[PDB]
Symmetry: C3
Subunit: 119 residues, 3 copies
């Protein structure tokens, strides 16, 4: 089965894409950036405040999709050229990919895309 | 089961790789660049035309594997720094309705120095 | 079923992460860098000795999960700025994505992520 996920607790995609799609038992979450869902405005803070907003958004999507943090299996982290993660990926310990790039959408510091599983 | 997807309407993969692979109900498409399968070279040189060729390439592979555009669930887009606006206009033609999960990031260099490269994952139950 | 994969033959996982997660018939392997599992230090040499090392680590994680190089269905290669590949992927002929980025972890020259399938 296939379902497009959408909750008001994570940034609202403005372009042609969804927050997350549940395909079978896998959940593919779109690249997340630091945007406060309630206000729709990008946080202009330090890497830790931005990274926390991102992880908060991902969690919102996981929850709306009916998953929990320990269902997360793979995380790709893109940074603009961290105990924060442990409270989120501690009981999960997903496989990780991390790279630095030129720029992210809306000149943000960090972007994260995730995949989760649930039997 | 595992299966290699090949089509004449998409650029031929160079080396020990494939255009796409169907594993179970998932279709993993290799990254595509704006190479016109008929001419064998990059198109015009403008973001719009390049984004179109890439999407056309992706469409062919999907079509070759018996999938459609609305089966695409995740797309990752790599750009070479800011033209990340026109890309969406062409992109909406192909994914405006099904709205796949997206990931967009800008990088250093892409294969053959193109301006855009896109990879996708499709799902068919 | 969800199972984290582990092998002493690959670089020890630092932080809240795994070398790989097995979900359903899929194996999601974390980004691998040219770290010599034995010494824990970056292997000496150029992009060729780093490539070898990376692919070797991937192979290690694969075998520890009961998978084969013929199982690799998708490969994502990050570079900073060859016959080895035919040896490791001439049998699986996976879908490929390759790009260049600003920098990799521990400022290495190459990072490779991968996905494998086994029915």
């Amino acid at each position: 089965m296939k379902e497009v996920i959408f909750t008001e607790n994570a940034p609202k995609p403005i372009g042609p894409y969804s927050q997350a799609i549940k395909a079978g038992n896998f959940l593919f979450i779109a690249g997340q950036i630091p945007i406060d869902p309630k206000t729709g405005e990008i946080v202009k803070g330090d890497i830790k405040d931005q990274t926390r907003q991102v992880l908060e958004n991902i969690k919102a999507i996981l929850e709306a999709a009916g998953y929990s943090l320990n269902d997360v299996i793979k995380v790709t982290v893109y940074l603009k050229d961290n105990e924060v993660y442990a409270e989120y990926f501690g009981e999960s310990k997903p496989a990780r990919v991390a790279v630095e790039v030129s720029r992210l959408p809306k000149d943000v510091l960090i972007e994260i895309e995730a995949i989760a599983y649930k039997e």
